DNA sequence: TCAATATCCACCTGCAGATTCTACCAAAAGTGTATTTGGAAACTGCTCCATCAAAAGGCATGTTCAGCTGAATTCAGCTGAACATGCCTTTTGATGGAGCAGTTTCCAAATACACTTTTGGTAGAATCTGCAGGTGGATATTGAT
DNA sequence: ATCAATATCCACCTGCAGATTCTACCAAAAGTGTATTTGGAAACTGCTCCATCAAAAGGCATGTTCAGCTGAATTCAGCTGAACATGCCTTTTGATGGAGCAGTTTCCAAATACACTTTTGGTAGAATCTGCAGGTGGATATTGA
């Protein structure tokens, strides 16, 4: 009787506060940001999906994701992209 | 009476509308057109307040973008006035209908 | 002991679990490694952080403390890389970068 | 009431305005009818698909996602509606 | 091991043009074609299902997807021949 | 064979396995494979028919890529459908702009 | 006897459009292919066919780009494609 | 890239149906072709590498062409 | 045209590289049975969307005028096509050796399940507050003398 | 080289429609204890993929001549921009009726899962064949006179 819908709204806002503590974002802009993350999400995962397949694999590893990222993102966006990922996965396994 | 030379207000407007983001087509006429076109595909259709807004966002966007390529096509012909052929070339190259 | 959200575990703001659940229910693959959700949440977090930064700056330049689309557009269209990444995308309400062909300007 | 010839609703001052944001300083007179022709084609194609999605979902209402998914098909990916 | 639509394309080749044969490469082009469309059609069908919170791709998905994927008369005809084949296979 | 049951040449079995092993959906309905197969067949039919003609027209009895392109690009609909595809060894439809011609 | 300027061209055009063979020299291309590749990864090895793909793709693209180029030159009243034309076409196609 | 001789380019521009060619075109065309290849190949390789291989098969190219919206028929699907 | 190139262009024809056709051996595809489910059918709560009514001013229209842009010519400088040459880098053709895609065959590590708690998020309400919309001189930017 | 004539800036104002926060339930991650696999890892093929090595032969590079294409410079008919007056229709605001999304239940009809038996389709011989590739002989398409 309620119908709960989800978005990365809360998360975007958390990241918004880290970069600019004094800045804020509007609903519409929060919407734009929501589309962004999904678009990208589907792009990354979809490419991931292909990689695994072209390679007769039934599991998408964090490795596929990364090559996906290389194929999808341009220049430094990708360089920096991969750095955060790797760091994130290394830190995760260790703790 | 004071009079601005031709082209001077054209440039004035360009700066004006490029600095803003509001929609340039009047809302009602567009909603009307959307229903007419949609009606000729399926009868008794209904539209979300937003669905129409979406369409109008896409449309304006598409057209403004076409006019840019359009204008680069007039400039290439040493002209300064966009024409249909300027619009058609742009769409041929784009691949909309070669 | 007390539970560690997998995200905090990797030191990420985005939801690693939400991401894992969307990877599975997505039908992208039969199975999903434990590192993928993590890795991906991270790439999405950083990309979000990247456009948010340039947007804020643009909000600053215009004497506003609230980011609106125009700012996102301005952000996306001025950086070469984000502009290429979001080349076939249109931001509702984002307008266009002010740009006048040189030939059209006065004599 | 019967909807007819509403493509004419897209006035000339409007098309100019859209041409201004495009960066056009001078507009040929034939442009107006040509622009309408193109807009009506764009719309058709995007609405056609939208509705196809409304039909497969068995709804009487075209929703915003319908449009968005539709725009996505024609590679005119919209941000801000879902 | 390895597989291709060479056999089936060739069979179809024969019905329409009994007298003509098809080269290697040309055969290769036809294979590329089938796969592609297959993917496009199957891909979209996957998408329809998903938007509709469905977990099963019915032939209805296939059909609708084909309406979205194929142009004009190619589309009309495609729905027919495929609907015809199901009507027939089912009974 | 399911394919003869549906009166088709194309493997309805092969496609069903392709859809199952494809990641397209959680589960695949019985009519799906049939339906699609037939569509892959028909489209194939259609392109071969035109190629034939082309080959025939060229005086050959063997369909080659060039015949396929001619077939494809001459028809508007197939051209829309394979608009972002290139047939290897296809060549291009002969077309010379009027202005470039001798006056 | 001398064929007036440009007459041959039309005969060159009619000719080359009529064929479907590649028109770039096999070895120089393959040499080009390997070279670029090696700047990305080393001790790579190409399938004979892989180079055919790359060449098929390159030529096809290039011929296509020229059709759009020509159209841009004609549009400016010129009959000789120039670099601005090639740039215009690419700029409109969305390549840069 | 200089291996891509001027008389071959002319041929390419000929199939494209071009009657007359400015002299600068050639260096220009060489530029563009270089970018094409660089982009198509980088992706091919990435794909080659993901497969943990030392050989760029014809399929890798095929896949990378798809990604660049330049789909190719005749070597795989 | 009348002529004198140089070009295409069907007509005919002869084999080797492909094609297409055989002949068999595994991998799927089909059966038979037994289950798990997905999601169509049956309510029905209720947002949201279709419609209308009013007052009001924002703007689309249509007309005058005339500035200056597009287009039509004309001209000649010199760039890019047609050529006949001279020479060498591509062709290709084996011939061979060997890096390496591809197959196995185990198996330890990483996943999937199936439940049971334990939070993190979302959907309302309660609180705030940028900033939209106006106002007003300061500052150019234009266009006439 | 000046100056009205106008439009464009920029800062100060201030209520209010659009965030920011504040709180309660709950759908969903998190935590464990099993029940499979998945896809590396040694071992090794049979490949295709490099490498020479070695001649010929188109095919590329050149340096001449000039034909005609690009480029720049005027001129002027008239198209389209700027403006004003007119008065229509799109906006704004809110009111209602109710069609038809969606959220739950209920449960057959249908898809999934093995375990097995049959048949088909992919390979590598064996057996035809279509075009490739020249080679005449004869209108064609060009270009000069
Ligand atoms: Cl240039
Ligand atoms: Mn109608
Ligand atoms: Mn021949």
Domains of chain C, residue spans? 1-107
The span from the CA of H16 to the CA of G68, in Å, is 9
Q: Which 8-state DSSP code applies to residue C86? A: T
DSSP string, G23-90: -S-HHHHHHHHHHHHHHHSSS-EE-HHHHHHHHHHHHHHHHHHHHHHHHHHHHTT-SEE-HHHHHHHH
What was the resolution (in A) of this experimentally determined structure? 3.0
> Which residue, A91, H65, B44, F4, is CA-closest to E32?
H65
- Distance, Å, A23 CA → J11 C1': 22
> Which residue, B52, E49, B60, is CA-closest to D63?
B52
| Domain that residue D75 falls in | 1-82
Say if CB D72 and CB D46 are below 8 A apart: no
Tokens matching residue E47: 């998408």
Q: What are all long-range contacts of A61-66, with beta carbons under 8 Å and residues at least 24 apart?
A: A61/C33, A61/C35, A61/C36, A62/A89, A62/C33, A62/C34, A62/C35, A62/C36, A62/C38, A62/C39, A62/C40, A63/C33, A63/C35, A63/H50, A64/C36, A64/H50, A65/C36, A65/C39, A65/C40, A65/C43, A66/C39
Cα dist. G63→B54, E83, F73, H14 in Å? 38, 41, 15, 8
CB contact burial E70-80 (16+ within 10 A = b; e otherwise):
beeebbebbbe
Find the Cα–Cα–Cα–Cα dihedral F45, F51, F53, F59, rounded to 10°. Answer: -140
G19 CB inside 7 Å of strand J: no
> Which residue, A72, H69, B58, is CA-closest to C82?
A72
Burial environment of residue E24 by CB neighbours within 10 A (0 to 12, 13 to 18, 19 or more): exposed
Distance H5 CA to ligand 3 centre (A): 29
In B1-98, DSSP assigns E strands to 46-47, 81-82
Q: Using an 8 Å CB-CB cutoff, list chain C residues near A66.
A: 39
Domain count of chain B? 1
**CB contact (8 A) between residue G40 and residue H42:** yes
The span from the CA of H16 to the CA of A1, in Å, is 63
Q: Using an 8 Å CB-CB cutoff, list chain E residues near D67.
A: none
The span from the CA of D10 to the CA of B27, in Å, is 10
CATH number where E12 lies = 1.10.20.10
Q: Which 8-state DSSP code applies to residue A8? A: S
Instruction: Look at the block and give the residue holding tokens 């198509």.
Output: H40
Domain count of chain E? 1
Q: Which 8-state DSSP code applies to residue F8? A: -
Say if CB H35 and CB G93 are below 8 A apart: no
* Residue list, CB under 5 A from ion ligand 2: B 40
Chain I nucleotides covered by protein, CB below 7 Å: 4-8, 18-20, 27-30, 37-39, 45-46, 48-50, 52, 59-61, 67-71, 79-83, 89-92, 99-103, 110-112, 118-124, 130-131, 142-144
Cα dist. F44→E85, F68, H30 in Å? 15, 11, 38
Say if CB E58 and CB E33 are below 8 A apart: no
A93 CB inside 7 Å of strand J: no
The span from the CA of F92 to the CA of F70, in Å, is 8
Q: H-type helices in chain E, by residue range?
A: 6-16, 24-51, 59-69, 72-90
> Which residue, B41, G92, A7, E56, is CA-closest to D70?
B41
Distance E52 CA to ligand 2 centre (A): 29
Judged by C1' against the alpha carbon of E23, the nearest nucleotide is I19
CA A2 to chain C, closest CA, distance in angstroms equals 20
Cα dist. D75→A34, D41, E66, H64, H75 in Å? 19, 15, 18, 19, 27
Size of interface B-G (CB pairs under 8 A): 35
In which element (H, E) is residue D61 found?
strand D61-62
F22 CB inside 7 Å of strand J: no
Cα dist. A84→A80, A90, E76 in Å? 7, 10, 50
The span from the CA of F16 to the CA of F20, in Å, is 6
Strand, coil or helix: what is H73? strand
* CATH 1.10.1740.10 for domain C1-107: no
G78 CB inside 7 Å of strand J: yes
Residues in CB range of G55: below 8 A, 6 or more apart: G22, G24, G26, G29, G30, G33
**CB contact (8 A) between residue B81 and residue D62:** no
| Domain that residue A17 falls in | 1-95
**Which chain G residue's Cα is nearest to B76?**
G76
The ligand with the least distance to the CA atom of D2 is 2
CA dihedral sign of residues D16, D22, D28, D34:
negative
> Which residue, F60, D21, G43, is CA-closest to B18?
D21
The span from the CA of D66 to the CA of B41, in Å, is 15
The chains found to touch C (3+ Cβ pairs under 8 angstroms) are: A, B, D, F
Cα dist. C37→A42, A52, E6 in Å? 13, 15, 40
Shortest CB distance from B38 goes to which of D25, D51, D71? Answer: D51
- Distance, Å, G12 CA → J135 C1': 24
> Which residue, E57, E62, E9, E58, is CA-closest to E40?
E62
Chain J nucleotides covered by protein, CB below 7 Å: 5-9, 11, 18-20, 27-32, 38-40, 48-50, 59-61, 66-71, 79-84, 89-91, 99-104, 110-112, 119-123, 130-131, 142-144
**CB contact (8 A) between residue A59 and residue C18:** no
Say if CB H16 and CB G63 are below 8 A apart: yes
Tokens matching residue H21: 């060619």
CATH number where H17 lies = 1.10.20.10
D17 CB inside 7 Å of strand J: no
Burial environment of residue G10 by CB neighbours within 10 A (0 to 12, 13 to 18, 19 or more): middle
- Distance, Å, E90 CA → J11 C1': 77
CA dihedral sign of residues G77, G83, G88, G90:
positive
Q: H-type helices in A1-95, by residue range?
A: 9-19, 27-54, 62-72, 75-94
**Is H74 in CB contact (< 8 Å) with chain E?**
yes
- Strand pairing of A59-60 and C31-32? parallel
**Is C52 in CB contact (< 8 Å) with chain A?**
yes
Burial environment of residue D58 by CB neighbours within 10 A (0 to 12, 13 to 18, 19 or more): exposed
What is F1-103's CATH topology?
Histone, subunit A (1.10.20)
CA D20 to chain B, closest CA, distance in angstroms equals 5
Burial environment of residue C68 by CB neighbours within 10 A (0 to 12, 13 to 18, 19 or more): buried
CA angle E10, F82, H15 (to 5 degrees): 100
The span from the CA of A32 to the CA of A11, in Å, is 14
**CB contact (8 A) between residue D80 and residue A39:** no
Phi/psi at A55 (5° precision): -110, 25
Residues in CB range of B52: below 8 A, 6 or more apart: B30, B31, B34
Instruction: Look at the block and give the residue holding tokens 């090559």.
Output: A67
In which element (H, E) is residue C99 found?
none
Q: After which residues is chain F broken (C to N over 2.5 A)?
A: none
- Measured over all CA atoms, what is the biggest interatomic distance in chain D, rounded to whole angstroms? 47
The chains found to touch B (3+ Cβ pairs under 8 angstroms) are: C, D, G
> Which residue, G25, G21, G86, G76, is CA-closest to H21?
G86
| Domain that residue B52 falls in | 1-98
Residues in CB range of H27: below 8 A, 6 or more apart: none
Strand, coil or helix: what is H20? strand
- Chains H and B make contact, 3+ CB pairs within 8 Å: no
CB contact burial D4-31 (16+ within 10 A = b; e otherwise):
eebbebbeeebbbbbbbbbbbbebbeeb
CATH number where G70 lies = 1.10.20.10
Structural determination approach: X-ray
Q: Using an 8 Å CB-CB cutoff, list chain A residues near D79.
A: 31-32, 35-36, 39
The span from the CA of C95 to the CA of B68, in Å, is 13
The span from the CA of F40 to the CA of F46, in Å, is 10
Phi/psi at F10 (5° precision): -50, 135
The ligand with the least distance to the CA atom of D7 is 2
Tokens matching residue A91: 């830190």
**Is B76 in CB contact (< 8 Å) with chain G?**
yes
- Distance, Å, F17 CA → I22 C1': 29
Residues in CB range of F91: below 8 A, 6 or more apart: F65, F66, F69, G17, G18, G19, G20, H15
């Amino acid at each position: 009787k309620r119908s709960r819908k989800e978005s990365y709204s809360i998360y975007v806002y958390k990241v918004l506060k880290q970069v600019h503590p004094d800045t804020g974002i509007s609903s519409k802009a929060m919407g734009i940001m929501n589309s962004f993350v999904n678009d990208i999400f589907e792009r990354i995962a979809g490419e991931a999906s292909r990689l695994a397949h072209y390679n007769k694999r039934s599991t998408i590893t964090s490795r596929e994701i990364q090559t996906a990222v290389r194929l999808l993102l341009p220049g430094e966006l990708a360089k920096h992209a991969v750095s955060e990922g790797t760091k994130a996965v290394t830190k995760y396994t260790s703790a | 009476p004071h009079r601005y030379r031709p082209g001077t207000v054209a440039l004035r407007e360009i700066r004006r509308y490029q600095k803003s983001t509001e929609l340039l087509i009047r809302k009602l006429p567009f909603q009307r057109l959307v229903r007419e076109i949609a009606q000729d595909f399926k009868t008794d259709l209904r539209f979300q307040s937003s669905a129409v807004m979406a369409l109008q966002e896409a449309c304006e966007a598409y057209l403004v973008g076409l006019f840019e390529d359009t204008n680069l096509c007039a400039i290439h012909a040493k002209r300064v006035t966009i024409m249909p052929k300027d619009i058609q070339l742009a769409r041929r190259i784009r691949g909309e209908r070669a | 002991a007390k539970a560690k959200t997998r995200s905090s575990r990797a030191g990420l703001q985005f939801p690693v679990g939400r991401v894992h659940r969307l990877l599975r229910k997505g039908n992208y693959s039969e199975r999903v490694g434990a590192g993928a959700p993590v890795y991906l949440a991270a790439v999405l977090e950083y990309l979000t952080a990247e456009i948010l930064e340039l947007a804020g700056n643009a909000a600053r330049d215009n004497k506003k403390t609230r980011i609106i689309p125009r700012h996102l557009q301005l952000a996306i269209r001025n950086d070469e890389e984000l502009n290429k990444l979001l080349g076939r995308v249109t931001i509702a309400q984002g307008g266009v970068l002010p740009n006048i062909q040189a030939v059209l300007l006065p004599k | 009431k019967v909807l007819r010839d509403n493509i004419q609703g897209i006035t000339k001052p409007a098309i100019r305005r859209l041409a201004r944001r495009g960066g056009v300083k001078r507009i040929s007179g034939l442009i107006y009818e040509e622009t309408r022709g193109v807009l009506k084609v764009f719309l058709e194609n995007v609405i056609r698909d939208a509705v196809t999605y409304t039909e497969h979902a068995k709804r009487k209402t075209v929703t915003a996602m319908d449009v968005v998914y539709a725009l996505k098909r024609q590679g005119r990916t919209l941000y801000g509606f879902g």
